[PDB]
PDB file of C-alpha atoms and ligand atoms in Angstrom:
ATOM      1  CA  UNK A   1      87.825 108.781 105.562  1.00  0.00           C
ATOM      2  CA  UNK A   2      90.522 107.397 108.017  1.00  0.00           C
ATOM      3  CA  UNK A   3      93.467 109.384 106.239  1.00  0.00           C
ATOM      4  CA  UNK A   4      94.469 112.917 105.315  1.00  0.00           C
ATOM      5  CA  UNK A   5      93.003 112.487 101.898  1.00  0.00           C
ATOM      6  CA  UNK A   6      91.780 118.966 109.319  1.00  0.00           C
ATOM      7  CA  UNK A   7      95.302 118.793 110.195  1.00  0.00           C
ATOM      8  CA  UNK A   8      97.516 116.309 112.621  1.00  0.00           C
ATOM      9  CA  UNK A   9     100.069 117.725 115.264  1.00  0.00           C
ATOM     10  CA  UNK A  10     103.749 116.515 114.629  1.00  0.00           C
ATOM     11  CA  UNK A  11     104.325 116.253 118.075  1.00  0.00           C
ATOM     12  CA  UNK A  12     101.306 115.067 120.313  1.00  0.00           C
ATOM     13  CA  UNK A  13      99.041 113.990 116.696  1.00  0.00           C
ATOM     14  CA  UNK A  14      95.780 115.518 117.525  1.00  0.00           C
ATOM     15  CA  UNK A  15      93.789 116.430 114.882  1.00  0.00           C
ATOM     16  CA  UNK A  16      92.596 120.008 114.742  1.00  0.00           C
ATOM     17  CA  UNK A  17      91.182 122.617 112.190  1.00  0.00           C
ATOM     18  CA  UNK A  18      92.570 125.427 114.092  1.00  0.00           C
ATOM     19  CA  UNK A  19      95.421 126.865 113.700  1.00  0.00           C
ATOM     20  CA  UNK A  20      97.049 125.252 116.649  1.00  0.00           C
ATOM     21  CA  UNK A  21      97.122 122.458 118.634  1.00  0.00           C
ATOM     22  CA  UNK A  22      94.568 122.798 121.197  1.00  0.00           C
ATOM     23  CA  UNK A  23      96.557 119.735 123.701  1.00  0.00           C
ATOM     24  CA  UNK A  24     100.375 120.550 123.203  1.00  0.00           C
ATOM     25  CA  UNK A  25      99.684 124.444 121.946  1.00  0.00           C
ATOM     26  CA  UNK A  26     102.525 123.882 118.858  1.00  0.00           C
ATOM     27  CA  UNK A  27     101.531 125.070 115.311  1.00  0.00           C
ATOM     28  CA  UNK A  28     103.318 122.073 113.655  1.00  0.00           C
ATOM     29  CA  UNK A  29      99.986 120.723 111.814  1.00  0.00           C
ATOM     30  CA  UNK A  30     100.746 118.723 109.363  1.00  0.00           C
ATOM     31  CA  UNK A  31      98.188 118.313 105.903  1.00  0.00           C
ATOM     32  CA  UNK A  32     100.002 114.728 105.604  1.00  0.00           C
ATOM     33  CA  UNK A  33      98.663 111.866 107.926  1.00  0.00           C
ATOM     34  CA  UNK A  34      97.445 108.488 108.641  1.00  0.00           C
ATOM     35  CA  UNK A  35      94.801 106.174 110.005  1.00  0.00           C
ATOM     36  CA  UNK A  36      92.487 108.281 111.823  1.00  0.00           C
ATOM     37  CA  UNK A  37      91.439 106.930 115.828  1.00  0.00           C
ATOM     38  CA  UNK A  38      88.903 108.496 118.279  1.00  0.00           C
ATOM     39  CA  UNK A  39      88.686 108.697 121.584  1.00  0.00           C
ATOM     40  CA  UNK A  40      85.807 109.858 123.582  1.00  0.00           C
ATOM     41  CA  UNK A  41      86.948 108.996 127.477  1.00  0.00           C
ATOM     42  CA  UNK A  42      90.563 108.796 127.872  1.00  0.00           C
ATOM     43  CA  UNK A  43      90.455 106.942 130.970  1.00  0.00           C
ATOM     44  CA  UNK A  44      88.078 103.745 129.709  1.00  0.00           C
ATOM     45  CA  UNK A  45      89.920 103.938 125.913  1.00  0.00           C
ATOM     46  CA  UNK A  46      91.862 101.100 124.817  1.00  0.00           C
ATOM     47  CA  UNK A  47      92.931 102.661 121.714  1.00  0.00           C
ATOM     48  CA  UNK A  48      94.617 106.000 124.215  1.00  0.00           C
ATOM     49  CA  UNK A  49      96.907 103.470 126.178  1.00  0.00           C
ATOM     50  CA  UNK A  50      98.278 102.269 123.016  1.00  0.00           C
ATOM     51  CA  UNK A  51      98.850 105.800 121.837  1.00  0.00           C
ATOM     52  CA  UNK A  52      99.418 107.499 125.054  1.00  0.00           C
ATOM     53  CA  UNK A  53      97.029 109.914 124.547  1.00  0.00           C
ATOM     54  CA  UNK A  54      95.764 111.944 127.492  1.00  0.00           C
ATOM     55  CA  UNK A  55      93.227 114.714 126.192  1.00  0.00           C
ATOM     56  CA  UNK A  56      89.789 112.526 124.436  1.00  0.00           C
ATOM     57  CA  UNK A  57      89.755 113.508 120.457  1.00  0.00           C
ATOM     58  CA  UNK A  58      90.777 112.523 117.200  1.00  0.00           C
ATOM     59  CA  UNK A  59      94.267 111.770 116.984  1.00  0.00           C
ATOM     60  CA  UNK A  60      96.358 110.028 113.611  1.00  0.00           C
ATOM     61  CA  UNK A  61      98.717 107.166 114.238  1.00  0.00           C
ATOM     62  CA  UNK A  62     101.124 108.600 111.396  1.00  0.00           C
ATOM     63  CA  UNK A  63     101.904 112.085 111.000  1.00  0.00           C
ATOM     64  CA  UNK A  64     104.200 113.252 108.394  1.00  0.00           C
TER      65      UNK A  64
HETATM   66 ZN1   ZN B 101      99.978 118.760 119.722  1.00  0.00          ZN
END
């Protein structure tokens, strides 16, 4: 696993092993992050309201 301990964007948190960040394009990945969620459909996902997340993945809740 749920942690670091693939890399998490600073800015949108998606978790990627490419080099950058396939939903906001940055190449801010960050080694360091935190508590691991997954969503498969955005629009029937619980967890992606709470996180605002608008592109189905794996995302971290903290990102350092
Ligand atoms: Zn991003």
């Amino acid at each position: 696993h749920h942690h670091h301990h693939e890399k998490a964007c600073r800015h949108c948190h998606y978790i990627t092993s490419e080099d950058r960040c396939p939903v906001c394009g940055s190449r801010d990945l960050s080694e360091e992050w935190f508590d691991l969620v997954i969503i498969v459909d955005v629009e029937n996902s619980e967890i992606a309201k709470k996180i605002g997340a608008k592109v189905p993945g794996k995302y971290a809740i903290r990102v350092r």
